[PDB]
Design a protein around this motif. Structure first.
Motif, PDB file in Angstrom:
ATOM      1  N   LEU A  74       0.869  -1.147  -0.014  1.00  0.00           N
ATOM      2  CA  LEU A  74       0.164   0.131  -0.007  1.00  0.00           C
ATOM      3  C   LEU A  74       0.613   1.161   0.010  1.00  0.00           C
ATOM      4  O   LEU A  74       1.727   1.373   0.917  1.00  0.00           O
ATOM      5  CB  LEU A  74      -0.888   0.027   1.369  1.00  0.00           C
ATOM      6  N   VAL A  75       0.675   1.992  -1.052  1.00  0.00           N
ATOM      7  CA  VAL A  75       1.221   3.666  -0.953  1.00  0.00           C
ATOM      8  C   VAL A  75       0.722   4.392  -0.058  1.00  0.00           C
ATOM      9  O   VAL A  75       1.264   4.954   0.748  1.00  0.00           O
ATOM     10  CB  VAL A  75       1.398   4.175  -2.387  1.00  0.00           C
ATOM     11  N   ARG A  76      -0.845   4.467  -0.437  1.00  0.00           N
ATOM     12  CA  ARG A  76      -1.654   5.501   0.411  1.00  0.00           C
ATOM     13  C   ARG A  76      -2.979   5.019   0.206  1.00  0.00           C
ATOM     14  O   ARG A  76      -3.366   4.111  -0.671  1.00  0.00           O
ATOM     15  CB  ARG A  76      -1.353   6.850  -0.006  1.00  0.00           C
ATOM     16  N   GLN A  77      -3.937   5.621   1.037  1.00  0.00           N
ATOM     17  CA  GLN A  77      -5.603   5.244   1.102  1.00  0.00           C
ATOM     18  C   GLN A  77      -6.070   6.598   1.431  1.00  0.00           C
ATOM     19  O   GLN A  77      -5.403   7.543   2.253  1.00  0.00           O
ATOM     20  CB  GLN A  77      -6.005   4.107   1.826  1.00  0.00           C
ATOM     21  N   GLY A  78      -7.199   6.859   1.105  1.00  0.00           N
ATOM     22  CA  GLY A  78      -7.996   7.986   1.463  1.00  0.00           C
ATOM     23  C   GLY A  78      -9.201   7.927   0.888  1.00  0.00           C
ATOM     24  O   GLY A  78      -9.941   7.100   0.238  1.00  0.00           O
ATOM     25  N   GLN A  79     -10.007   9.217   0.757  1.00  0.00           N
ATOM     26  CA  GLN A  79     -11.262   9.296   0.327  1.00  0.00           C
ATOM     27  C   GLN A  79     -11.138  10.547  -0.954  1.00  0.00           C
ATOM     28  O   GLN A  79     -10.497  11.596  -0.492  1.00  0.00           O
ATOM     29  CB  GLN A  79     -12.506   9.488   1.008  1.00  0.00           C
ATOM     30  N   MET A  80     -11.642  10.463  -2.047  1.00  0.00           N
ATOM     31  CA  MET A  80     -12.120  11.421  -2.948  1.00  0.00           C
ATOM     32  C   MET A  80     -13.057  12.602  -2.479  1.00  0.00           C
ATOM     33  O   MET A  80     -13.469  12.213  -1.089  1.00  0.00           O
ATOM     34  CB  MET A  80     -12.217  10.856  -4.336  1.00  0.00           C
ATOM     35  N   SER A  81     -13.131  13.472  -3.154  1.00  0.00           N
ATOM     36  CA  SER A  81     -14.284  14.707  -2.674  1.00  0.00           C
ATOM     37  C   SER A  81     -15.624  13.987  -2.546  1.00  0.00           C
ATOM     38  O   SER A  81     -16.246  14.570  -1.847  1.00  0.00           O
ATOM     39  CB  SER A  81     -14.178  15.774  -3.893  1.00  0.00           C
ATOM     40  N   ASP A  82     -15.729  12.930  -3.280  1.00  0.00           N
ATOM     41  CA  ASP A  82     -17.350  12.462  -3.436  1.00  0.00           C
ATOM     42  C   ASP A  82     -17.422  11.447  -2.137  1.00  0.00           C
ATOM     43  O   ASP A  82     -18.529  10.856  -2.050  1.00  0.00           O
ATOM     44  CB  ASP A  82     -17.177  11.433  -4.596  1.00  0.00           C
ATOM     45  N   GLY A  83     -16.489  11.275  -1.132  1.00  0.00           N
ATOM     46  CA  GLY A  83     -16.523  10.257  -0.145  1.00  0.00           C
ATOM     47  C   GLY A  83     -16.507   8.941  -0.426  1.00  0.00           C
ATOM     48  O   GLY A  83     -16.669   7.727   0.284  1.00  0.00           O
ATOM     49  N   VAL A  84     -15.946   8.573  -1.550  1.00  0.00           N
ATOM     50  CA  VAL A  84     -15.414   7.278  -2.149  1.00  0.00           C
ATOM     51  C   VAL A  84     -14.087   7.054  -1.546  1.00  0.00           C
ATOM     52  O   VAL A  84     -13.229   7.703  -2.071  1.00  0.00           O
ATOM     53  CB  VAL A  84     -15.568   7.159  -3.395  1.00  0.00           C
ATOM     54  N   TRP A  85     -14.095   5.957  -1.084  1.00  0.00           N
ATOM     55  CA  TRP A  85     -12.792   5.510  -0.372  1.00  0.00           C
ATOM     56  C   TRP A  85     -11.943   4.531  -1.663  1.00  0.00           C
ATOM     57  O   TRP A  85     -12.514   4.183  -2.210  1.00  0.00           O
ATOM     58  CB  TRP A  85     -12.959   4.362   0.649  1.00  0.00           C
ATOM     59  N   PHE A  86     -10.593   5.010  -1.386  1.00  0.00           N
ATOM     60  CA  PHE A  86      -9.756   4.267  -2.649  1.00  0.00           C
ATOM     61  C   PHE A  86      -8.429   3.928  -1.748  1.00  0.00           C
ATOM     62  O   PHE A  86      -8.037   4.250  -0.701  1.00  0.00           O
ATOM     63  CB  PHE A  86      -9.335   5.309  -3.561  1.00  0.00           C
ATOM     64  N   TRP A  87      -7.709   3.067  -2.382  1.00  0.00           N
ATOM     65  CA  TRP A  87      -6.415   2.508  -1.959  1.00  0.00           C
ATOM     66  C   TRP A  87      -5.419   2.575  -3.177  1.00  0.00           C
ATOM     67  O   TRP A  87      -5.802   2.201  -4.419  1.00  0.00           O
ATOM     68  CB  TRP A  87      -6.366   0.946  -1.572  1.00  0.00           C
ATOM     69  N   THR A  88      -4.274   3.025  -3.031  1.00  0.00           N
ATOM     70  CA  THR A  88      -3.090   3.047  -4.177  1.00  0.00           C
ATOM     71  C   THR A  88      -2.237   2.020  -3.772  1.00  0.00           C
ATOM     72  O   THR A  88      -1.477   2.118  -2.670  1.00  0.00           O
ATOM     73  CB  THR A  88      -2.657   4.210  -4.404  1.00  0.00           C
ATOM     74  N   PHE A  89      -1.803   1.131  -4.519  1.00  0.00           N
ATOM     75  CA  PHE A  89      -0.933  -0.136  -4.398  1.00  0.00           C
ATOM     76  C   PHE A  89       0.045  -0.156  -5.288  1.00  0.00           C
ATOM     77  O   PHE A  89      -0.165   0.206  -6.559  1.00  0.00           O
ATOM     78  CB  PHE A  89      -1.568  -1.762  -4.352  1.00  0.00           C
ATOM     79  N   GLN A  90       1.393  -0.600  -4.885  1.00  0.00           N
ATOM     80  CA  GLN A  90       2.513  -0.704  -6.167  1.00  0.00           C
ATOM     81  C   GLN A  90       2.714  -2.248  -6.027  1.00  0.00           C
ATOM     82  O   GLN A  90       2.901  -2.892  -5.037  1.00  0.00           O
ATOM     83  CB  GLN A  90       3.572  -0.036  -5.835  1.00  0.00           C
ATOM     84  N   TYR A  91       2.988  -2.999  -7.149  1.00  0.00           N
ATOM     85  CA  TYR A  91       3.164  -4.463  -7.257  1.00  0.00           C
ATOM     86  C   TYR A  91       4.397  -4.647  -8.403  1.00  0.00           C
ATOM     87  O   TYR A  91       4.029  -4.062  -9.529  1.00  0.00           O
ATOM     88  CB  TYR A  91       1.981  -5.432  -7.631  1.00  0.00           C
ATOM     89  N   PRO A  92       5.512  -5.457  -7.993  1.00  0.00           N
ATOM     90  CA  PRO A  92       6.295  -5.989  -8.951  1.00  0.00           C
ATOM     91  C   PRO A  92       5.739  -6.850  -9.967  1.00  0.00           C
ATOM     92  O   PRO A  92       4.798  -7.858  -9.465  1.00  0.00           O
ATOM     93  CB  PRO A  92       7.461  -6.770  -8.249  1.00  0.00           C
ATOM     94  N   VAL A  93       6.023  -6.710 -11.308  1.00  0.00           N
ATOM     95  CA  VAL A  93       5.252  -7.685 -12.248  1.00  0.00           C
ATOM     96  C   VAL A  93       6.376  -7.915 -12.921  1.00  0.00           C
ATOM     97  O   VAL A  93       6.961  -7.152 -13.872  1.00  0.00           O
ATOM     98  CB  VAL A  93       4.136  -7.204 -12.957  1.00  0.00           C
TER      99      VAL A  93
END
Length: 137
Positions: A74-93
């Motif tokens: 996990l890089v970061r997580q939070g909510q957009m202006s709309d109250g929608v939760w999100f998560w940003t991940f990074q993965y080696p591929v």
């Protein structure tokens, strides 16, 4: 539910499906992945395929695409202006075009995936990838 671990697993599952493609059935495999993405997210997948000339090589040279996704973070997580939760991940591929007689060299990347929540009445997973960015590793 919808813990960050649940979201991380959703992303790694998507990457596994996205980059293991069969030279006969790849078009059907790709269309079947759409539920895992918003349409903007899916554009990032299409861009990643084009950047490695995957579809043309699969079609012309009759090669399969194989890929292995490493442990992500996990890089970061939070909510957009709309109250929608999100998560940003990074993965080696790491991925490789493989034919019957020979193969192309393996390529290594780190994929960044942003997953957002979705109304489970619309998608029962409650999630979709809204952004996919491939970076050379």
């Amino acid at each position: 539910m919808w813990s960050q671990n649940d979201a991380m697993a959703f992303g790694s599952q998507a990457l596994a499906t996205a980059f293991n493609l069969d030279f006969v059935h790849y078009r059907s495999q790709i269309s079947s992945l759409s539920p895992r993405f918003s349409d903007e997210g899916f554009a990032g997948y299409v861009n990643a395929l084009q950047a490695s000339n995957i579809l043309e090589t699969i079609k012309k040279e009759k090669m399969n695409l194989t890929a292995t996704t490493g442990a992500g973070v996990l890089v970061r997580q939070g909510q957009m202006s709309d109250g929608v939760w999100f998560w940003t991940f990074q993965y080696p591929v790491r991925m490789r075009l493989v034919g019957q007689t020979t193969s192309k060299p393996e390529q290594s990347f780190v994929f960044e995936i942003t997953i957002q929540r979705v109304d489970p009445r619309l998608k029962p997973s409650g999630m979709e990838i809204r952004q996919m960015i491939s970076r050379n590793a």
